[PDB]
Ligand binder design. Sequence first.
Ligand SMILES: *[C@@H]1O[C@H](CO)[C@@H](O[C@@H]2O[C@H](CO)[C@@H](O)[C@H](O)[C@H]2NC(C)=O)[C@H](O)[C@H]1NC(C)=O
Ligand SMILES: *[C@@H]1O[C@H](CO)[C@@H](O[C@@H]2O[C@H](CO)[C@@H](O)[C@H](O)[C@H]2NC(C)=O)[C@H](O)[C@H]1NC(C)=O
Ligand SMILES: *[C@@H]1O[C@H](CO)[C@@H](O[C@@H]2O[C@H](CO)[C@@H](O)[C@H](O)[C@H]2NC(C)=O)[C@H](O)[C@H]1NC(C)=O
Ligand SMILES: *[C@@H]1O[C@H](CO)[C@@H](O[C@@H]2O[C@H](CO)[C@@H](O)[C@H](O)[C@H]2NC(C)=O)[C@H](O)[C@H]1NC(C)=O
Ligand SMILES: *[C@@H]1O[C@H](CO)[C@@H](O[C@@H]2O[C@H](CO)[C@@H](O)[C@H](O)[C@H]2NC(C)=O)[C@H](O)[C@H]1NC(C)=O
Ligand SMILES: *[C@@H]1O[C@H](CO)[C@@H](O[C@@H]2O[C@H](CO)[C@@H](O)[C@H](O)[C@H]2NC(C)=O)[C@H](O)[C@H]1NC(C)=O
Ligand SMILES: *[C@@H]1O[C@H](CO)[C@@H](O)[C@H](O)[C@H]1NC(C)=O
Ligand SMILES: *[C@@H]1O[C@H](CO)[C@@H](O)[C@H](O)[C@H]1NC(C)=O
Lengths: 84, 269, 197, 49
Amino acid sequence: QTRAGCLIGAEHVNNSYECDIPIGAGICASYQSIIAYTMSLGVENSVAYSNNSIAIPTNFTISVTTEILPVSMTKTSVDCTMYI
Amino acid sequence: CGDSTECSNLLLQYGSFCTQLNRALTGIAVEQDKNTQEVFAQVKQIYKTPPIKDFGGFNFSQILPDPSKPSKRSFIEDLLFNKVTKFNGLTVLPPLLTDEMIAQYTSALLAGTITSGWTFGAGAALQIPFAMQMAYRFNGIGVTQNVLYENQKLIANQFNSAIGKIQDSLSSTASALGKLQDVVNQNAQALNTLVKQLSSNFGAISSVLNDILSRLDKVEAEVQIDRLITGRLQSLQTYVTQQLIRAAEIRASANLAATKMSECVLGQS
Amino acid sequence: STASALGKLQDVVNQNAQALNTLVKQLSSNFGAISSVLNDILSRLDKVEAEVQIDRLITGRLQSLQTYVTQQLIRAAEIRASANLAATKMSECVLGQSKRVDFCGKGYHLMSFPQSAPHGVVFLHVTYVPAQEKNFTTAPAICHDGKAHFPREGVFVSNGTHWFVTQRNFYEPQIITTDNTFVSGNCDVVIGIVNNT
Amino acid sequence: LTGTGVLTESNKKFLPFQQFGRDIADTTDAVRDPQTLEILDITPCSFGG
Ligand SMILES: *[C@@H]1O[C@H](CO)[C@@H](O[C@@H]2O[C@H](CO)[C@@H](O)[C@H](O)[C@H]2NC(C)=O)[C@H](O)[C@H]1NC(C)=O
Ligand SMILES: *[C@@H]1O[C@H](CO)[C@@H](O[C@@H]2O[C@H](CO)[C@@H](O)[C@H](O)[C@H]2NC(C)=O)[C@H](O)[C@H]1NC(C)=O
Ligand SMILES: *[C@@H]1O[C@H](CO)[C@@H](O[C@@H]2O[C@H](CO)[C@@H](O)[C@H](O)[C@H]2NC(C)=O)[C@H](O)[C@H]1NC(C)=O
Ligand SMILES: *[C@@H]1O[C@H](CO)[C@@H](O[C@@H]2O[C@H](CO)[C@@H](O)[C@H](O)[C@H]2NC(C)=O)[C@H](O)[C@H]1NC(C)=O
Ligand SMILES: *[C@@H]1O[C@H](CO)[C@@H](O[C@@H]2O[C@H](CO)[C@@H](O)[C@H](O)[C@H]2NC(C)=O)[C@H](O)[C@H]1NC(C)=O
Ligand SMILES: *[C@@H]1O[C@H](CO)[C@@H](O[C@@H]2O[C@H](CO)[C@@H](O)[C@H](O)[C@H]2NC(C)=O)[C@H](O)[C@H]1NC(C)=O
Ligand SMILES: *[C@@H]1O[C@H](CO)[C@@H](O)[C@H](O)[C@H]1NC(C)=O
Ligand SMILES: *[C@@H]1O[C@H](CO)[C@@H](O)[C@H](O)[C@H]1NC(C)=O
């Protein structure tokens, strides 16, 4: 039983993974016997902040990424007498 | 229909309107989670501020999460939450992201942007003291960094006074959040009038299926049922179209918000 | 090798195909008539009565057509917005280097390349991403002879014994000279002043 | 009056001339029984997705 309802066929665990099938109300599932659990926002780290420390990169990389954008669709025309 | 064999049989031969309506509603429902994810989920990891707080004289206690509260919501968030204010086949589904993880994303953003600066928006977060990030940010509006370091205390005091005044204005003045309230009211009244449409004759002798079924025979009730079906279908179609228009508007606004937070939070626009 | 990387265009094509297909399929529906074929309901019936059935079919088909047109209009508005954004990216990232953060690629932008696609465009974004960090030690200002010196452009760092000035996105040390420093007042107000030469 | 749901005790009170109450969209919420003369409220049976 969860906040969004209930699951039948799944077994709850107390771990945390970045899930792929969102269930709802934070609960979400994975295959691994199907299991469901609480999603993990991400691996949590703490920056060692202070008032006198910086972090200057010493090397670099160039990455080529891609993105895709639709610009148009097919042009369609429809009669009235012929169709109706 | 509402649990009627005759109504289901009559609705069956009306094509596949229902499938289209359900598909459209599901699409616009998924779009909300899409919007929230594409807005907030900008950071690969989750950061947490160190317990020792000394930001060169500034003060963020009213915006950092408060561990005392179970929801870990900062004070301003609680003020906002306090400021802002049945079953007939329609249902409300919960959002995928609950409030606590949303608060955690906000805290991660707000604690990365304090110590790391803007560098955490491109590669890996790099620590740097706040009093120097301000020098960098003056250096980006045509004012040399010369100014700041002689005016650290005055600037800090002005910032604290301004943030306190914002707190008081939010606490006292009502209806300061008109846009969100308007959106909520619009949704509520749309649902309410959709519910209220169920009590219209539409030309039928009554507005209840069971009674006209129980008082008539299965030859003449056909016409009355047909009138009711077509009227209700028209109303539902209208409601769906209005929902689509409003959803497109909200998507435009969310795109604007994502752009604003990517450009102004992760760097100096 | 990896498929499913072009979900948007495939989704657009599938949406158009589904809308057209269901519009066509709507012909077979009855809409409360006696049949979905005009010729048979015309032949089996007589004049003053079949008119009602034909009217039912006509109004049902007309409603379906109007619904299809409205859906087309909404989708057209969405595609217009997307194409406006695409034109903007075409104009200000292909034809020049962009400054706004995270508009053209993750990291500091270098350029873009356009490629066609059956109903859209594909941008290859060439960006820049640093790595291999360290710590060093910082001080906001360096005062010599009692008067402060701020760096003209860069930031102060040190490796324990020798202080150096560098730029912000690449480790590169330089000795300090007046050529890259400018004075402002005396070091008594700034919090973080450290001695040096 | 034909309906389908689950009946339960209603804590409200009707006026002597009152017969049954409805709230919105002709939802007959409470009904007095014609024989024993008490008001029971009706709630729809559980449904979901
Ligand atoms: C910065 O990172 C690059 C990326 O790996 C390094 O380039 C490699 O260097 C090694 C050592 O000479 C070579 O064997 C590889 O062939 C290089 N990679 C490529 C793609 O040619 C580079 O050495 C790093 N620089 C520093 C100073 O650490
Ligand atoms: C930062 O602001 C907080 C909130 O205003 C300060 O906490 C309050 O400080 C006042 C005056 O010192 C006290 O009267 C209150 O009792 C404090 N409230 C709480 C909940 O602690 C805090 O002192 C400020 N700190 C700095 C360094 O400016
Ligand atoms: C710079 O030195 C600090 C320590 O002064 C290093 O900080 C590490 O931070 C991680 C993340 O929380 C901790 O798990 C480690 O224990 C810390 N190391 C310590 C305390 O020695 C940091 O890795 C160094 N480098 C950079 C780029 O910050
Ligand atoms: C910090 O960097 C400076 C700059 O190179 C280092 O100083 C040089 O160190 C090398 C190697 O010991 C010597 O051969 C040079 O004569 C030094 N030059 C000067 C001007 O001192 C210094 O050793 C580095 N220190 C640390 C702790 O890394
Ligand atoms: C950075 O912060 C540390 C810790 O708050 C400061 O160190 C303190 O400095 C005061 C002033 O001399 C001393 O009285 C304390 O004993 C110091 N404590 C520790 C733990 O070092 C440091 O001065 C700050 N530096 C800057 C440039 O702001
Ligand atoms: C930097 O050096 C100057 C002088 O070399 C320091 O100024 C004074 O130095 C004398 C000699 O030790 C002290 O008796 C005074 O107390 C110093 N005055 C002050 C205001 O500190 C100065 O302190 C040094 N600053 C740093 C950060 O090392
Ligand atoms: C772990 O998960 C199981 C099943 O979901 C639950 O019964 C148990 O209380 C949880 N906690 C621990 C500590 O086992
Ligand atoms: C109604 O009439 C029947 C038949 O006489 C009787 O058994 C019953 O007690 C009556 N109920 C009331 C409330 O008078």
